[PDB]
Structure formats: C-alpha cells, structure tokens
Amino acid sequence: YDIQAWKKQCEELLNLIFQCEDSEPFRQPVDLLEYPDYRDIIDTPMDFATVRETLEAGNYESPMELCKDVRLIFSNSKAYTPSKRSRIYSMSLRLSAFFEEHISSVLSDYKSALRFHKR
Numbered sequence: 001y002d003i004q005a006w007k008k009q010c011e012e013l014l015n016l017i018f019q020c021e022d023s024e025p026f027r028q029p030v031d032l033l034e035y036p037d038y039r040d041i042i043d044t045p046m047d048f049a050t051v052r053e054t055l056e057a058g059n060y061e062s063p064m065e066l067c068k069d070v071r072l073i074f075s076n077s078k079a080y081t082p083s084k085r086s087r088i089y090s091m092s093l094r095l096s097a098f099f100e101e102h103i104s105s106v107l108s109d110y111k112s113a114l115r116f117h118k119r
C-alpha cells in the first residue's frame with residue numbers, strides 16, 4: 001500500500017530499457033537531418049531520455065502519466081514506419097512487449113494503494 005513506490009520501480013524499468021540494444025534508436029529525439037520529413041508525419045516527438053528526465057525532475061504525478069508518454073514513443077514509430085517489416089519498427093515492437101509485461105504490476109500496485117488510502 002506504498003503510494004510513492006511506483007517512482008523507483010519506474011526508474012529501475014527505464015534502466016533495464018536503456019541496457020537493451022533494441023532501445024538505441026529511441027534513447028534521444030529522432031534526428032531530422034537523417035529523416036527530414038519526420039515532423040510532417042509526427043506532431044508530438046517523444047524519447048526515453050525525455051521520459052527519464054521528466055521522472056527525475058518530479059514532473060510525473062502517477063505511473064499512468066509515464067505510461068502514456070512511453071506508449072507515444074511506440075505509436076510514433078508505428079506512424080512513421082514505411083513498412084511493418086522495417087528494422088527500427090521491429091525493434092519498437094519487441095521493446096513495447098517488454099515494457100507492457102513489466103509496467104502492469106507497477107500500475108496495479110499504485111491503483112490498489114490509492115484505493116486503500118481512500119477506503
């Protein structure tokens with residue numbers, strides 16, 4: 001029933017993600033010299049360094065907010081890919097499966113802790 005425990009849990013999950021080779025294209029903003037049409041397709045850029053900095057600044061109130069930004073990384077990759085077989089899209093799908101497998105207990109524990117607080 002610890003309402004604050006999600007923050008360290010999310011820091012540890014982001015450290016695992018940074019150690020994964022599949023995260024390398026997503027650790028920093030997409031390079032516009034490499035992909036000059038990117039902002040014609042993608043309205044709201046996101047990357048894992050931005051997510052980690054927002055967490056460390058104390059600018060997430062809940063793990064739901066962090067999960068929305070991570071899911072935006074993956075939806076942007078799906079929208080920009082020219083093919084569902086592309087190398088960088090293929091990396092995003094494996095990273096998404098890993099993230100969803102680990103975030104489910106973080107979300108469930110936080111929501112249970114808040115319900116106990118409000119009982």
Ligand SMILES: Cn1c(=O)ccc2ccccc21
Binds near residue numbers: 035081082088
């Ligand atoms: C830059 N980039 C992305 O950021 C995401 C998907 C993708 C797929 C193929 C080629 C480049 C790509």
